[PDB]
Structures are given as C-alpha cells and as structure tokens.
Design a binder for this molecule. Structure first.
Ligand SMILES: [K+]
Ligand SMILES: [Mg+2]
Ligand SMILES: [Mg+2]
Ligand SMILES: [Mg+2]
Ligand SMILES: [Mg+2]
Ligand SMILES: [Mg+2]
Ligand SMILES: [Mg+2]
Ligand SMILES: [Mg+2]
Ligand SMILES: [Mg+2]
Ligand SMILES: [Mg+2]
Ligand SMILES: [Mg+2]
Ligand SMILES: [Mg+2]
Ligand SMILES: [Mg+2]
Ligand SMILES: [Mg+2]
Ligand SMILES: [Mg+2]
Ligand SMILES: [Mg+2]
Ligand SMILES: [Mg+2]
Ligand SMILES: [Mg+2]
Ligand SMILES: [Mg+2]
Ligand SMILES: [Mg+2]
Ligand SMILES: [Mg+2]
Ligand SMILES: [Mg+2]
Ligand SMILES: [Mg+2]
Ligand SMILES: [Mg+2]
Ligand SMILES: [Mg+2]
Ligand SMILES: [Mg+2]
Ligand SMILES: [Mg+2]
Ligand SMILES: [Mg+2]
Ligand SMILES: [Mg+2]
Ligand SMILES: [Mg+2]
Ligand SMILES: [Mg+2]
Ligand SMILES: [Mg+2]
Ligand SMILES: [Mg+2]
Ligand SMILES: [Mg+2]
Ligand SMILES: [Mg+2]
Ligand SMILES: [Mg+2]
Ligand SMILES: [Mg+2]
Ligand SMILES: [Mg+2]
Ligand SMILES: [Mg+2]
Ligand SMILES: [Mg+2]
Ligand SMILES: [Mg+2]
Ligand SMILES: [Mg+2]
Ligand SMILES: [Mg+2]
Ligand SMILES: [Mg+2]
Ligand SMILES: [Mg+2]
Ligand SMILES: [Mg+2]
Ligand SMILES: [Mg+2]
Ligand SMILES: [Mg+2]
Ligand SMILES: [Mg+2]
Ligand SMILES: [Mg+2]
Ligand SMILES: [Mg+2]
Ligand SMILES: [Mg+2]
Ligand SMILES: [Mg+2]
Ligand SMILES: [Zn+2]
Lengths: 145, 102, 111, 49, 155, 117, 44
RNA sequence: GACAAUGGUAGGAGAGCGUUCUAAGGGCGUUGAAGCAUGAUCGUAAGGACAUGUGGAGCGCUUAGAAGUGAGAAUGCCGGUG
RNA sequence: UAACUUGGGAGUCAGAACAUGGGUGAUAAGGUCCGUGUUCGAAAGGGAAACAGCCCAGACCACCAGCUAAGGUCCCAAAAU
RNA sequence: ACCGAUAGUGAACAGUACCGUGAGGGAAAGGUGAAAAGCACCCCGGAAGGGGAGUGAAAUAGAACCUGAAACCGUGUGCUUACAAGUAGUCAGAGCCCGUUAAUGGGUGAUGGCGUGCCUUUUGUAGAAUGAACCGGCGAGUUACGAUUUGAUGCAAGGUU
C-alpha cells in the first residue's frame, strides 16, 4: 500500500546558507551548491516541489582554477545573428564578472525545467566578503568536498 | 509506537487503529488476523529485528475482501496489426490494526 | 420575470450579427437602444426590432417595469444556409453560402 | 426433444471462417493470402499442374 | 449486381489528370446506388437423408411421445357433422394439453373440419406423419386403426 | 436477409470518445484521433506501471542517502552495514522511518555502523 | 500559397481576439435620445 | 495442491462477443417498446446491465436454424459541415 | 527431449547490420558475392547522449517489495568526491 | 427465415428535372395529428418573425411539421492559464470546486518523470515515402455445380437411388 511522504508548500521549510568561495575549486564548489539548491540533502526531498535551501556565495573573485583554465577555458555565446559568436576566457570572466562566472557554473548543474529555473533563482553570488542578506540570518555552511 | 510488518511480499508501517490494504489473505471478513513477521517496533522502546523481532505480533480485524479498481491493460505494436486488451482487478484485503504486541 | 423575442431566418450571416450583439449584452434597455441606433452595421436595425419586440412582450404580456429592464441574454444561432454558386474562370463554379441567423433577445427586471 | 430445446450431435456442426473481418481473427486485412503476387489476386493463381 | 443495375455503361471520367479517384462505372459497388457484391441469390435449401434415417426419426418421435405419456389411443372418432364445439369438448374430456396432434387412419373430413379452427390442434393421417408435427405436439391422439396402420407402415 | 449497419457502430465509437474525456480539442471530440490517443494512453500506462516502481525506489534511495549523510555516512555503506547486521527493512520503510522518527533511524545507523566495525 | 494544416478552433478564436467593434462615441441630447458626439441631431 | 508454460509479422489451430431474420418455448410494454442522451456499473476481451431524461409503439430472453453479420484508411461513393 | 511417417491448411522465393573465413574492388564504400555465428526482420525492457541490426536481456496480469546483468556511482541524474 | 427510403426498380413523391447538335446519359425528393380540431383574439413589427391567448394527450407535434446521432456554430461558468519549447498523453502530485450505480468517489490541475500519431509498404518509415479536412451512412472470399479431406450420423458385404 502507498505510504510515501510527499512534501508540499505547507510543510517545506527553506533555510539560508552562506558559502565562502575563497580557495575553492570552481566546479567542486559548484556541484555541492547545486545539490543544496535542489533539496538533495533533505530527507523530505520531493522531485515535483522545491525543497531546497537558499545559498549565498561570497568571495567569488577568489575562486580557483587548475591547469591552464584561466586562459584556455573559453565561454561561447551566440546572439542568433549570422556571425554573432562571442567568447571570453574563464580568467577574463573571473576578473570582470566573478559572480556571473560562479552563477553560470552552478546553474549549468541544475535542470532546465520550470522548477529548475525557480531553484536557481535561490542563488546569490558576491565577489567580496560581504553580502546584503543579514536580515535572512544565513548560517555558515562548510563544503564536504 | 509503530511496527514494520512483512505481508504479501511487501512491508508496511502501521500504527494502532490504522486501516491498511494488503494482498489477499486467506481469511473471512470480521475475523482476527495476526501478523507474525515484525521487522521493527518504534516508539519509546525501539526494537530492531534481525530480521524479525522475536515474539512480536500485530493483530488486526478484517474489514473487507474486495477487488481493486478495474485496470484496462492495452498494448499494441504499430504497423504490425498486433494488439491486446485485457482487464484486471487486483484482489485485496482491508484490515484495521488493533494491537501492536512487541 | 423574463421576456423574450426571436427573429428567425434573418438573411445575415451569424458572424456579423454577433459583432453587434456583443455590444448590448448585459446592458440596460435604454442604453442598448441607443447603442443599436448609433451603431453603423447592417444587423443594427434588425437587432433593434428584436429588442423592441422583447420590451413590448415584457410590458404587454407580463406587466414589467419597462425602465428597469436589462438585456439579460442576446445571442444569434445559425439558421439554414442558402446554397448559391458564382461562375469563375475556365468554366468552373464556386460555392457561395448565403447564411442566415436566428436572433434571440431576453430582457429581465432582475427580480 | 422439444423444438425449443434442439441439440445437434456433438462435433457435427462447426462455425465457418470469415476472412477480412478485422485483425483479431488472424485472417483480417490480407485474409490469409499473404502479400502481393499472382496468388494474392482475385481470380488469381495458375492452373492445376 | 453491377451488371444488372440500370445504366452505368460509360467511364465516369478519364483515368488520369482530374485529381479524382479512378472509376469505371457509376454503378460500381462502392457507389451509392451501385451494384451489390454477392448478396442473396435465389436457391433451394432442401436436402435429403437416407430413407432408413427418415424412418428412424419418425420412430424416435413416436417413441418420445410414448415415453412422456403423450400417447392417447381412442376407439374411433364419431363425427357425422362438423362442429368445433363438440371436438373442443372431446379434447376437454380426454384431459389433453393445448398442443395436440390428431391422427386418423385416412382423411377424415369431419374430424379435420371440427378441429381445424382450434389453436394448438393439428390433424393428420397415419401416412402424413412427419417429425415437425409430432415434435411440436405435447400429446398424440390416435385412433386404434391409425395406430395399427402406423405400426404396419413403420414396422 | 439484410443486416443494416444499425446502432453498433455508434455505440463502439461513443465508448472510445467517452474514454477520451479531458483530451485537448479534437482529441476528445473526433473518433479517429480519440481512438489513436486512447491506444497511446494504454501503451503509456502499461509502460508507466512498470516505470513507477523504479521511480519510487529511486525516491526512497535519495531520501535514505540524505538521512544517512546526516549521520556522517553514505547510502552504500549504510546499506552494506544493514545487510551485514541482518536487518531486512526495505527502502520505503527506511525512508519513512527517517522522515517520521529520527531517533529510531539513528539507532538503525548505529546498528549498521557496528556491523561494519 | 495554401494552408499546410487546418486551423483549429483554438487558433481561430485566438486570432479573432481583436476582431470586434467598439461602442459608438455617444452623448445624451440635453434638450432634443442619444447622439454621436460632434454630430447634429438630424432627426429631432 | 504442486510443478511447468504463456513477446511475436506472414501464416496454421481453438474458443468466444455482437448484428438482422426464422422456429419453438417463455416474457416485457401507453403505470411508456425500439431509438437517442447522461451517469461515479459489471465482465479476461469482443461486450452486458441498471438508473434518469427524451421518445411514443413496439421489443427482449432461452435453445436451435440462416446470413446483404461488424470499417479508419481504397487520391473509395453520397450527404452534411468546417 | 525430441525424432520420423502419413494426411488437412499454409505463408515465404526484395532481406539488413555486426563479427569472422574468403572472392571482387583499391588489404575503398553503410559496395558487392559466397562460408560461419548472432541480432533485427517478427522483440518490448536496461546500456551505447539521440541511434532496427552493437552490449545485457526475451514483457501472462497486478505491487509505492527484494537480488542482480550490461553499464555505472562530483551536479544534470540512482549509486564511492 | 426477400428490401424497407444511400435499401428495394433509375423511378414509393421519373425516363421527369437537368446535360448533349444528336445517338445518348440521367438525378434529387417518403412520415403533422386519432381527428384540421391547421393557432379566433391581443401585443411588437412595413413584412418576415416572434410573445401571449386558444386547439390538442403532446405545439421543442405549427406544416422546412415522428424520432432528431455526429461533425460544426453559439451563450453561461466550476477549475485553470500571459518566463513559456510542446505527437498534447501517461505515471507521480499539491491546491481549489463538488458529492456518485458509495466506490481504498467525481471535476480541474501548480509542478516533476517518461514519451517522434495512425495506416500502407518496406532490409529499414517520426519520416521530408503512400493515404485520410472532419462527421455520418454505404463500401470487399459469396453462391451453384463437381472434386478431395476431416468431423457427425444411419446401415454394413453391402450402401444408395
Ligand atoms: K513523393
Ligand atoms: Mg465560358
Ligand atoms: Mg497472424
Ligand atoms: Mg487495417
Ligand atoms: Mg505469395
Ligand atoms: Mg497489401
Ligand atoms: Mg514481394
Ligand atoms: Mg478481376
Ligand atoms: Mg453494364
Ligand atoms: Mg430488415
Ligand atoms: Mg456501415
Ligand atoms: Mg502469444
Ligand atoms: Mg515471456
Ligand atoms: Mg483459421
Ligand atoms: Mg467462434
Ligand atoms: Mg454471436
Ligand atoms: Mg429492431
Ligand atoms: Mg456488410
Ligand atoms: Mg475515406
Ligand atoms: Mg467545405
Ligand atoms: Mg565492408
Ligand atoms: Mg551491404
Ligand atoms: Mg553471412
Ligand atoms: Mg528469435
Ligand atoms: Mg530492443
Ligand atoms: Mg532497450
Ligand atoms: Mg539506447
Ligand atoms: Mg556522442
Ligand atoms: Mg535511452
Ligand atoms: Mg553514437
Ligand atoms: Mg544491490
Ligand atoms: Mg544518473
Ligand atoms: Mg545521485
Ligand atoms: Mg430514414
Ligand atoms: Mg431509390
Ligand atoms: Mg403559434
Ligand atoms: Mg405569436
Ligand atoms: Mg402566440
Ligand atoms: Mg402554437
Ligand atoms: Mg420533444
Ligand atoms: Mg423532428
Ligand atoms: Mg528567464
Ligand atoms: Mg506564470
Ligand atoms: Mg515551442
Ligand atoms: Mg520528455
Ligand atoms: Mg517484411
Ligand atoms: Mg527502399
Ligand atoms: Mg507523421
Ligand atoms: Mg513534417
Ligand atoms: Mg505508391
Ligand atoms: Mg493527402
Ligand atoms: Mg468517412
Ligand atoms: Mg476463392
Ligand atoms: Zn437630439
């Protein structure tokens, strides 16, 4: 007989975490943050509802790469105009927009569904050691790595 | 207090007074049925069977010997002029849990 | 109560009638009369006559208020279609549908 | 034996096979003829021998 | 069939080029008002069986009447003039069911006339006995002479 | 004799159309597309009755993984410990216990850890 | 040149969303029922 | 009771569902037949009931018999309507 | 656990890929022609992103039970950061 | 154990209407009610058409007249929908609205998984190969006489006309 618990908006409790990016590898931090955003760390995980938590990433400018990714990892985008292929290196992106660097890295590890877009909207990335969400009282979170 | 019982090749979490639906048991409505395979007993005192809690029973009262909602099983293979339609109603026994006897 | 009038087999296509009908649905009788009088569409005087007939039914047959009436319902159903043909080039004939409408108006005092 | 209780002898009667009446019979569509060729045609087939 | 329906000689339109389905006659079977494919054709349904089987069937019907207490033998029918009421009363006095077959040795005109109009009553001679008539009846009313003649002819 | 087409055609088609209640547009209206969609629905439902068992086992495993990592353990090691401890509680029950009774689940984790060490 | 597929009821009514007429611009006649704004009575 | 088997095209074999008509038996119907419409009903399938509305005079059931006996496709035919 | 014989009823005579032994071609072809095996044809399910013919494996029906195969276990996306 | 208005005559009301120079080809079209009792009279309207009032068992039987399916066209609204990528369903599923042939009910459905119609023809078709605008009706292994085989039944060195 059917007995499996199903979370819903009436019983889900979403928390706030702050994660320090300084000294961390890009994708290794990113995959754990993606897990947190999707509620995979909750015993009440329910695939059709958002059980995940809010994540604040600080010190985005201090994220680290291995190898020659600073100059050899390239981000491409197309403008949907006949020759509109544009590019930027991972190093130049880290220099000029580290919040975009980390946000894109994390969102690339979330489903492209409606729920996935909603869950990615719970991510807040900042290049420095400060964030404006003191009112939500985030708790420090340590990556298992 | 809850117990995990094994019946019908499946496991069910029960509490006293709960109505449960299990695969058909050889029993009549109104009769008392005792479940002998208790894997786990919860609550204040917690008991863990390896795999069953020795001496533990869950007794219940049969409320109904029914058949489930009709399922129309239909399959086909396109372009092969081949298909099959069959009805199915799965028997079940409804019971109400009376006493968890650890 | 409610009073009704119907004009059946009006030789206007229901698509065109319904455009005017949409203007007066739910409006007060006097407002609907003014709308129909000032609307520049072929259906307008036909619909106006149906509405006048409904108001006359109200007054004469049910002794209704005649000044607190609203257009409770107003719709046009499809009547039988006159099938016609237009000669085209190369000796070919093309179908012409001369559609008709059934026009209904219901007025009521709301009681 | 009454006229309202008639019974043929067991095994003496058998229902005839009607082809081309749907897929489930197994003789629908091609009606047992297979696909194409001379033997699939109305009036089709070579003379005996 | 398509050959017997009136008209339909000409090809309705040319084989190719018009965009329509190819057609050969307006009386083809898929056309409204067209010829019928197969369908009923006048024929007989009568068939025959060996004479010995016919005799066995007659004996079986008579024997079934005998077992089910459906055989009544009367001395002789005494009917000088036809009168349906008299035959009705006679069947009343013999405790007969509704469906009765009356068997006389030869053609008895007065018996046939008196029993003709009574529903459920049928009259035949010994020579005229057939399986449908015997089987339909609930009881048999046969004279002594007719019984003897039946026994002689059917052995 | 002649057998007219009669009422059987309409009855069969109306059955299919009623089965297509709630479908989009013509798929709940016209017999041909309704029949095609009802066939598709039967095939999908047959496939999905089998897929449902996979889906729910997966959900229970995900929840058990979360609960076990709350006790510094992975799913795979926890299940290995439970098997070595002779505990036969299946995944639905384990996930329901983890949701409902945290303390009982903690005792189960203790037993699994003890059977491994 | 020709429709590849027929237009459903839904698409047709979607397209007809804006196919409508508006209430005439009309004002009450202070002395002489209702009239078009900036027009004379022409019948009163 | 206890063991086995049960994917399937051409195709072979078996068992059934439903349609119209006939015979016999037994029934229903103006206190409302057939048909139609709606429904959360029953059967392993084809399919079978019941209740309510509409309808206004015919129709089931059982056993057997006989077929113009079952349509989604034929650039199919006719009609209606997009 | 079949085999054979005698009868009633067939359908089939366009095959395809893969592996392998060879001809042909150019130790070209998703080429072509033979030998051998498998699968597809007439086979759904899991894997190979998608993908008849490859790998695992042959669906009587139901289950919100369990163990495994190929293949896998950072996130997408189940299981070892 | 023939048809029952697309059937049965082509024709239930026609070799007409219509087409063709002509020979010739050749349709569609049945049903008020038991009885015309076929709606006096009043009201809106030029009329058409309606709403009443009457007739009738019934007028949503009012002559375009028995029943009145589907496609198709409208009016009202219980749930839902304007950040979303799709063979339209299916499995999971909150929220809201209802309450049944009372059944581990009905309607709708945020959101998640899975998912390239059908038929034909093909080695192989989501196929950009064929066919179907939709709905309805009609539309294809029949019968006769022979042959052979199987089952059934009667009789049997005979069986049968
Ligand atoms: K082509
Ligand atoms: Mg000209
Ligand atoms: Mg077959
Ligand atoms: Mg077919
Ligand atoms: Mg062949
Ligand atoms: Mg073919
Ligand atoms: Mg061929
Ligand atoms: Mg021919
Ligand atoms: Mg001819
Ligand atoms: Mg008939
Ligand atoms: Mg038909
Ligand atoms: Mg099989
Ligand atoms: Mg199998
Ligand atoms: Mg066969
Ligand atoms: Mg059969
Ligand atoms: Mg039958
Ligand atoms: Mg009938
Ligand atoms: Mg037929
Ligand atoms: Mg067609
Ligand atoms: Mg059209
Ligand atoms: Mg090669
Ligand atoms: Mg090749
Ligand atoms: Mg080979
Ligand atoms: Mg095989
Ligand atoms: Mg496969
Ligand atoms: Mg597979
Ligand atoms: Mg695959
Ligand atoms: Mg690839
Ligand atoms: Mg796949
Ligand atoms: Mg590949
Ligand atoms: Mg395992
Ligand atoms: Mg995965
Ligand atoms: Mg995982
Ligand atoms: Mg008719
Ligand atoms: Mg005719
Ligand atoms: Mg009138
Ligand atoms: Mg009137
Ligand atoms: Mg009137
Ligand atoms: Mg009237
Ligand atoms: Mg009526
Ligand atoms: Mg009518
Ligand atoms: Mg966006
Ligand atoms: Mg939105
Ligand atoms: Mg899109
Ligand atoms: Mg998908
Ligand atoms: Mg083939
Ligand atoms: Mg080819
Ligand atoms: Mg397609
Ligand atoms: Mg296309
Ligand atoms: Mg072709
Ligand atoms: Mg086409
Ligand atoms: Mg059609
Ligand atoms: Mg033949
Ligand atoms: Zn004025």
């Amino acid at each position: 007989m059917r007995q499996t618990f199903m979370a819903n908006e009436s019983n889900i409790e979403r928390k706030w975490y702050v994660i320090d990016a300084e000294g961390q590898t890009l994708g290794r931090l990113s995959s754990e943050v993606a897990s947190i955003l999707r509620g995979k760390n909750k015993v009440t995980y329910t695939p059709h509802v958002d059980t995940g938590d809010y994540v604040i990433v600080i010190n985005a400018s201090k994220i680290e790469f291995t190898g020659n990714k600073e100059t050899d990892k390239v981000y491409y985008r197309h403008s949907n105009h006949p020759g509109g292929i544009k590019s930027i290196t991972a190093g130049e992106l880290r220099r000029t927009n580290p919040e975009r660097l980390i946000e894109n890295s994390i969102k690339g590890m979330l489903p492209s569904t409606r729920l996935g877009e909603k869950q990615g909207k719970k991510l807040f990335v900042y290049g420095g050691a400060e964030h404006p969400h003191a009112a939500q009282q985030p708790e420090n979170y340590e990556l298992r790595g | 207090m809850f117990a995990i019982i094994e019946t019908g090749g499946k496991q069910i979490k029960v509490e006293e007074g709960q109505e449960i639906f299990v695969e058909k048991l050889d029993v009549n409505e109104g009769d008392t049925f005792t479940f002998d395979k208790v894997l786990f007993v919860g609550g204040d005192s917690v008991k863990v069977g390896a795999p069953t809690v020795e001496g533990a029973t869950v007794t219940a009262t049969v409320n109904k010997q029914g058949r489930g909602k009709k399922i129309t099983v239909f399959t086909y293979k396109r372009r092969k002029n081949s298909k099959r339609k069959k009805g199915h109603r799965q028997p079940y026994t409804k019971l109400t849990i009376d006493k968890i006897n650890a | 109560m409610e009073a009704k009038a119907v004009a059946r087999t009006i030789r206007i296509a229901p698509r065109k009638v319904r455009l005017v009908l949409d203007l007066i649905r739910g409006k007060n009788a006097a407002e609907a009369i003014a709308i129909l009088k000032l609307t520049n569409k072929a259906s307008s005087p036909v619909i106006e006559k149906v509405l006048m007939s409904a108001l006359a039914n109200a007054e004469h047959n049910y002794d209704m208020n005649t000044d607190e009436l609203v257009v409770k319902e107003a719709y046009a159903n499809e009547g039988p279609t006159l099938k016609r043909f237009r000669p085209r080039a190369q000796g070919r004939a093309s179908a012409i549908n001369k559609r008709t409408s059934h026009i209904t108006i219901v007025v009521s005092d709301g009681k | 034996m009454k006229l309202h209780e008639l019974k043929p002898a067991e095994g003496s009667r058998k229902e005839r096979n009607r082809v081309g009446r749907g897929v489930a019979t197994g003789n629908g569509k091609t009606s047992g003829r297979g696909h194409k060729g001379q033997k699939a045609r109305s009036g089709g087939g070579v003379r005996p021998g | 069939n398509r050959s017997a329906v009136s008209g339909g000689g000409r090809k309705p339109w040319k084989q190719k080029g018009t965009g329509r389905a190819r057609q050969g006659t307006i009386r083809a079977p898929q056309w409204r008002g067209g010829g019928i494919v197969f369908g009923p054709t006048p024929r007989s349904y009568a068939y025959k069986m060996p004479k010995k089987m016919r005799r066995l069937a007659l004996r079986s019907a008579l024997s079934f009447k005998a077992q089910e207490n459906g055989l009544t033998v009367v001395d002789a029918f005494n009917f000088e003039a036809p009168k349906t009421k008299e035959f009705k009363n006679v069947l009343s006095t013999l405790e007969q069911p509704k469906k009765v077959l009356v068997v006389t040795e030869n053609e008895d005109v007065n018996v046939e006339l008196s029993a003709r109009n009574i529903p459920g009553v049928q009259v035949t001679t010994a020579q005229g006995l057939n399986v449908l008539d015997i089987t339909n009846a609930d009881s048999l009313v046969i004279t002594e002479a007719a019984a003897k003649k039946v026994e002689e002819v059917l052995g | 004799p002649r057998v007219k087409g009669g009422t059987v055609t309409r009855a069969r088609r109306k059955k299919t159309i009623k089965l297509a209640k709630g479908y989009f547009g013509s798929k709940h209206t016209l017999y041909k597309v309704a029949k095609q969609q009802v066939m598709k629905s039967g095939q999908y439902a047959f496939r999905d009755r089998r897929q449902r068992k996979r889906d729910f086992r997966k959900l229970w495993i995900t929840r058990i993984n979360a609960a076990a990592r709350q006790h510094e353990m992975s799913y795979s090691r926890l299940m290995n410990g439970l098997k070595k401890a002779g505990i036969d509680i299946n995944r639905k029950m384990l996930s329901e216990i983890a949701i409902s009774d945290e303390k009982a689940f903690a005792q189960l984790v203790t037993k699994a850890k003890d059977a491994l060490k | 040149a020709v429709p590849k597929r027929r237009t459903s009821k839904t698409r047709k009514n979607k397209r007809r969303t804006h196919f409508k007429i508006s209430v005439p611009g009309m004002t009450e006649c202070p002395n002489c029922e209702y009239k078009l704004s900036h027009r004379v009575c022409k019948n009163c």
